[PDB]
């Protein structure tokens, strides 16, 4: 019953210079399972932050 | 170094200098100091001009 | 194997970071990926930067 994944994949800065064999160099996305507070810390700008 | 591949001291103070631009890239003194970074880009090729 | 036939059963994957010395030591001879270390950036022992 969970929804799908609407991802706009972008292959920016891709080149074909006969660079040996095809391979990946960078990959990132913006999804995650929910997480629980493990630790926390304070930064000297004022803002606390939990990890 | 760091995640952004910018030169930085032990505290978080980014290191700056003249950025190099062009192809072949070369320094220029007419640009203001910029945060130096060692990129992860794949250097482009160049056609043969003589032999 | 018995009949003089080879079988490949997997390849060990190596990891390289955009920045070392950000790794957190975790007791025994091992480090943990975290901030100030970058993403895993897996690969193979053959070529690349490994």
Swiss-Prot record, chain A:
It is found in: Bacterial flagellum basal body. Belongs to the flagella basal body rod proteins family. This is Flagellar hook protein FlgE. It comes from Salmonella typhimurium (strain LT2 / SGSC1412 / ATCC 700720). The chain holds residues 253 to 303 of 403 of the full protein.
């Amino acid at each position: 019953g969970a929804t799908a994944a609407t991802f706009s994949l972008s292959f920016l800065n891709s080149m074909q210079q006969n660079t040996g064999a095809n391979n990946i160099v960078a990959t990132n996305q913006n999804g995650y399972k929910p997480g629980d507070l493990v630790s926390y810390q304070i930064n000297n700008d004022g803002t606390v932050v939990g990890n | 170094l760091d995640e952004n591949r910018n030169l930085v001291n032990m505290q978080g103070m980014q290191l700056t200098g003249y950025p190099a631009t062009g192809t072949p890239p070369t320094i220029q003194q007419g640009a203001n100091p910029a945060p130096i970074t060692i990129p992860n880009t794949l250097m482009a090729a160049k056609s043969t001009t003589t032999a | 194997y018995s009949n003089e036939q080879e079988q490949v059963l997997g390849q060990i994957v190596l990891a390289n970071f955009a920045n070392n010395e950000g790794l957190a030591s975790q007791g025994d001879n091992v480090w943990a990926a975290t901030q100030a270390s970058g993403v895993a950036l897996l690969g193979t022992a053959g070529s690349g930067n490994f």
